[PDB]
Amino acid sequence: LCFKLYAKGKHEKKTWFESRDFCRALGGDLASINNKEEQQTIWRLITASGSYHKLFWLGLTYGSPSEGFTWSDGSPVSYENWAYGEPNNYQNVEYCGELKGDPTMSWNDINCEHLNNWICQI
Ligand SMILES: CO[C@H]1O[C@H](CO)[C@@H](O)[C@H](O)[C@@H]1O
Ligand SMILES: [Ca+2]
Ligand SMILES: [Ca+2]
């Protein structure tokens, strides 16, 4: 699949669910990062667009307590790149995953209603 960055001003930022719906309407989904190669592809896309250090929704959403975090596209959550100490469900309200678009490419769980950039796959 092809990844596409949506780096938006405040007017066009989206919640996790809004971002998921946008990517699905176009024929894809929010991006799943299933290995280091995908991660490095997205990092290069971030550098090519000058989007260094921006935050982006990924397809990470909590499933059942048993499943834990899942990918919206249904791929297995095998590879992980959570930031140290994450996911921490800070204040019990963090059920969606965002990418910190710096060289670490780390993930953090945050409130699903936060307005963010996002990355689609198509
Ligand atoms: C204070 O809350 C923020 O910082 C902590 C630690 O980084 C994260 O876990 C959390 O999701 C928020 O981004
Ligand atoms: Ca993937
Ligand atoms: Ca967190």
Author numbering: 640 to 761
Q: Which of the paper's sentences describe this entry?
A:
The human mannose receptor expressed on macrophages and hepatic endothelial cells scavenges released lysosomal enzymes, glycopeptide fragments of collagen, and pathogenic microorganisms and thus reduces damage following tissue injury. The receptor binds mannose, fucose, or N-acetylglucosamine (GlcNAc) residues on these targets. C-type carbohydrate-recognition domain 4 (CRD4) of the receptor contains the site for Ca2+-dependent interaction with sugars. The mechanisms of binding to monosaccharides and oligosaccharide substructures present in many of these ligands were examined in multiple crystal structures of CRD4.
The binding of α-methyl mannose to CRD4 is revealed by four independent copies of this complex observed in three different crystal forms: two copies of the CRD in form αMeMan/1 and one copy of the CRD in αMeMan/2 and αMeMan/3. Binding of mannose residues to CRD4 results primarily from interaction of the equatorial 3- and 4-OH groups with a conserved principal Ca2+ common to almost all sugar-binding C-type CRDs. As in other C-type CRDs, the main determinants of monosaccharide binding to CRD4 are a conserved principal Ca2+ and four of the five amino acid residues that surround it. In addition to the Ca2+ ligands, the side chain of Tyr729 makes van der Waals contacts with the bound sugar. The position of the aromatic ring of Tyr729 is established in part by interactions with the side chain of Gln730. In some of the crystal forms, the conformation of the side chain of Ile749 produces an additional contact with the bound sugar. For example, while there is a single conformation of the side chain of Ile749 in the αMeMan/3 crystals, there are multiple conformations in the αMeMan/1 crystals. In the αMeMan/1 crystals, the electron density map shows multiple conformations for Ser671 and Glu677. These side chains, as well as the Ca2+, have been modeled at 50% occupancy, with one of the partially occupied chain conformations binding to the Ca2+.
